[PDB]
Coordinates of C-alpha atoms in Angstrom, one line a residue:
Chain A
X1 CA 80.3 -65.4 -172.8
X2 CA 80.0 -66.4 -169.2
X3 CA 80.9 -63.2 -167.1
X4 CA 80.7 -63.4 -163.4
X5 CA 79.9 -60.5 -161.1
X6 CA 79.3 -56.9 -160.8
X7 CA 77.3 -54.5 -158.6
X8 CA 75.7 -50.7 -158.6
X9 CA 76.2 -50.2 -162.5
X10 CA 76.5 -46.6 -163.3
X11 CA 76.4 -46.1 -166.9
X12 CA 75.1 -48.3 -170.2
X13 CA 75.6 -47.7 -173.6
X14 CA 74.4 -50.0 -176.7
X15 CA 75.3 -50.6 -180.3
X16 CA 76.0 -47.0 -181.6
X17 CA 77.9 -48.9 -184.3
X18 CA 76.0 -52.3 -183.7
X19 CA 79.3 -54.3 -184.7
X20 CA 82.3 -52.2 -183.4
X21 CA 89.6 -60.9 -196.6
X22 CA 90.5 -59.2 -193.4
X23 CA 90.4 -55.7 -192.0
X24 CA 92.8 -53.8 -189.8
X25 CA 90.9 -52.5 -186.8
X26 CA 92.5 -49.3 -185.3
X27 CA 91.1 -47.7 -181.9
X28 CA 92.3 -44.9 -180.1
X29 CA 90.9 -44.6 -176.3
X30 CA 91.2 -41.4 -174.3
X31 CA 89.9 -39.8 -171.1
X32 CA 89.7 -36.1 -171.0
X33 CA 87.8 -34.2 -168.2
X34 CA 85.6 -37.1 -167.4
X35 CA 84.6 -37.9 -171.1
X36 CA 85.7 -41.3 -172.3
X37 CA 86.2 -41.1 -176.2
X38 CA 86.8 -43.8 -178.7
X39 CA 88.0 -43.2 -182.2
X40 CA 88.2 -45.8 -184.7
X41 CA 88.4 -47.0 -188.2
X42 CA 88.7 -50.3 -190.4
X43 CA 91.3 -50.5 -193.2
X44 CA 90.8 -53.2 -195.9
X45 CA 93.7 -56.0 -195.7
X46 CA 94.9 -57.6 -198.9
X47 CA 97.6 -59.8 -197.2
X48 CA 99.9 -57.0 -196.5
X49 CA 99.7 -56.4 -192.7
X50 CA 99.2 -52.6 -192.1
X51 CA 98.2 -51.5 -195.5
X52 CA 100.3 -48.2 -196.2
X53 CA 98.8 -44.7 -197.1
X54 CA 97.7 -42.2 -194.5
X55 CA 94.4 -43.1 -192.8
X56 CA 92.7 -41.1 -189.9
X57 CA 90.6 -42.4 -187.2
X58 CA 87.0 -41.0 -187.1
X59 CA 85.2 -40.5 -183.6
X60 CA 83.2 -43.5 -182.5
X61 CA 81.7 -42.7 -179.1
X62 CA 81.8 -39.9 -176.4
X63 CA 80.8 -41.2 -173.0
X64 CA 80.1 -38.7 -170.2
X65 CA 81.2 -41.1 -167.5
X66 CA 83.7 -39.4 -165.3
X67 CA 85.5 -42.6 -164.6
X68 CA 89.2 -42.5 -163.2
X69 CA 91.3 -44.8 -165.6
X70 CA 95.0 -45.8 -164.6
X71 CA 95.2 -49.2 -166.0
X72 CA 93.3 -51.4 -168.6
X73 CA 93.3 -55.0 -169.5
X74 CA 92.3 -56.5 -173.0
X75 CA 89.7 -59.2 -172.8
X76 CA 90.6 -62.1 -175.4
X77 CA 88.4 -65.0 -176.4
Chain B
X1 CA 55.3 -37.4 -151.0
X2 CA 58.3 -37.2 -153.5
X3 CA 61.6 -35.5 -152.8
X4 CA 64.2 -34.7 -155.4
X5 CA 67.7 -34.6 -154.5
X6 CA 69.4 -32.8 -157.4
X7 CA 72.7 -33.8 -156.1
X8 CA 75.1 -32.5 -158.6
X9 CA 78.7 -33.7 -159.0
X10 CA 82.0 -32.8 -160.2
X11 CA 82.0 -35.4 -163.2
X12 CA 80.5 -34.2 -166.3
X13 CA 76.7 -35.2 -166.8
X14 CA 74.1 -34.7 -169.2
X15 CA 70.9 -34.8 -167.2
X16 CA 68.9 -31.6 -168.5
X17 CA 65.6 -30.1 -169.1
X18 CA 64.3 -30.5 -172.6
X19 CA 65.4 -27.8 -175.2
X20 CA 62.6 -26.5 -177.3
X21 CA 63.3 -26.0 -180.9
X22 CA 61.8 -23.5 -183.2
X23 CA 61.0 -24.0 -186.9
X24 CA 64.0 -23.3 -189.1
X25 CA 64.3 -20.3 -191.5
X26 CA 66.6 -19.8 -194.4
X27 CA 67.6 -16.9 -196.6
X28 CA 66.8 -14.2 -193.9
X29 CA 69.0 -12.6 -191.4
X30 CA 68.3 -14.2 -187.9
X31 CA 69.9 -15.1 -184.8
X32 CA 70.5 -18.8 -184.3
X33 CA 71.5 -21.3 -181.7
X34 CA 72.3 -24.6 -183.2
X35 CA 73.1 -27.2 -180.2
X36 CA 74.9 -24.6 -178.2
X37 CA 76.5 -22.6 -181.1
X38 CA 75.3 -19.2 -181.4
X39 CA 75.5 -16.3 -183.6
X40 CA 73.8 -13.8 -186.1
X41 CA 73.7 -14.6 -189.9
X42 CA 71.8 -15.6 -193.1
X43 CA 71.3 -19.5 -193.2
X44 CA 71.2 -20.9 -196.9
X45 CA 71.4 -24.5 -198.2
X46 CA 74.8 -25.6 -198.4
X47 CA 76.7 -27.6 -201.1
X48 CA 79.2 -28.7 -198.6
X49 CA 79.5 -32.4 -197.7
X50 CA 80.2 -33.2 -194.0

């Protein structure tokens, strides 16, 4: 949680869902006509990875940012 | 002196004037506009679960 440096911040968004024996955490990230959309769902895990049965992801956020995305990196602890 | 640029840009953006809302009326034939969805009809309480 150290972070480093950024400038000229354009958009902010906080705690729409506040947080987002185990749970599968599925996300879909898409960028259409300047709107960045995130869809996600949590599925309980009982020790079987990827519990079976159909499960659809509900929309999480819709950000009217206009950012051009060509690459992304996952940030791990 | 205050000068307002109102520059506008290609990217989608939501700065907008406030939209006033009237009072709701049910069981009568009315025109309606619900968050940009427009039409004419009779509004009644629904049993549908969204």
